[PDB]
Design a binder for this molecule. Sequence first.
Ligand SMILES: NS(=O)(=O)c1cnc(Sc2ccccc2)c(C(=O)NCCc2ccccc2)c1
Ligand SMILES: [Zn+2]
Length: 257
Amino acid sequence: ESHWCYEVQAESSNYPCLVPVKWGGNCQKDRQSPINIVTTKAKVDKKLGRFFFSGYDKKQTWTVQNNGHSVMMLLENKASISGGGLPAPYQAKQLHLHWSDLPYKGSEHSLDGEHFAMEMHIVHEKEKGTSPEDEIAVLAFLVEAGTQVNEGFQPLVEALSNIPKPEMSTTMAESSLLDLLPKEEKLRHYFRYLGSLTTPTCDEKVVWTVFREPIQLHREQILAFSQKLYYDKEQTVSMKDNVRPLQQLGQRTVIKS
Ligand SMILES: NS(=O)(=O)c1cnc(Sc2ccccc2)c(C(=O)NCCc2ccccc2)c1
Ligand SMILES: [Zn+2]
C-alpha cells in the first residue's frame, strides 16, 4: 500500500508513493487549496475586521518536530484568535511551513501568479458553542528573503539542527508566536476564501486567511530549512518543495479586508 508524498519525493527515490495528482481522501474534490489569488478580482468586504490574538504574546518553550512532511510546532491550545470575520474564537493547534530552496517556488498559495520562498500555516480550530466548512482557520503567511535577520525566527531555525530526520522532536528555546508574525500594521490586509487542508485527507473544512504582505527572513534562515531537514531517516533527500500544486478556484470567490 503506498502513502502520500510530494512530487519531489517520488522523483528523488525508489519509494512508490502517491504523488499529489493521485492523493485519496477528499483531495480530488472541488473546494481544494491552495489556489492562485487574482488580487484585483478579490472584492473588499467590510465584514472582514482586524484579527485579535491571545496567548500570542506569551514566551514559551514549544515542542517542534519533523513528521516527514514539514517541521511542525505543537501549539497545544496555548493561543487563540478571533475577529478577522471569523464566527467564534479559534484555538491554535500547530504551526508548520512549506518551502523550497529557490525564491519563486516554496509557497503554496500564489498572488497574481507570484509564488514566494516559503509559506507558514498556523492551524486553529473553531471553539464550540457559538452556533462543516469553517471548522479550521489557517493563517497563512508568505515568506520572502530580506536584508535583515528575522530574530523572532531564530529559536525555530536553531531547533531545526535537532530534528534532521522524520519522527524526531525537540524543544525550542523560549519564544512567543508573536516573534513569528510581522507587526500588527502588516496584518491589516488579507484575503479570505473557503477551501481545504493541503495534505490528505484534504478535508474541505478550512476558512483560509492569506495575508497580503510577506514576512521577511534572511536568506540563510530560509535556506536552513532545506539544509538541515530530510524527508528520509538515511538523510539522502533534503526536505524542500513540500508544496501541494495549485488547485482550481471553481465557483468560489476570494474576498479581502
Ligand atoms: N497544510 S494545511 O492545510 O495548513 C494543514 C492543516 N492542518 C493540518 S492537521 C490539523 C487539522 C485540523 C485541526 C488540527 C490539525 C495539516 C496536517 O497535519 N497535515 C499532515 C502533516 C503535514 C503537516 C504539514 C505540512 C505537511 C504535512 C495541514
Ligand atoms: Zn500547510
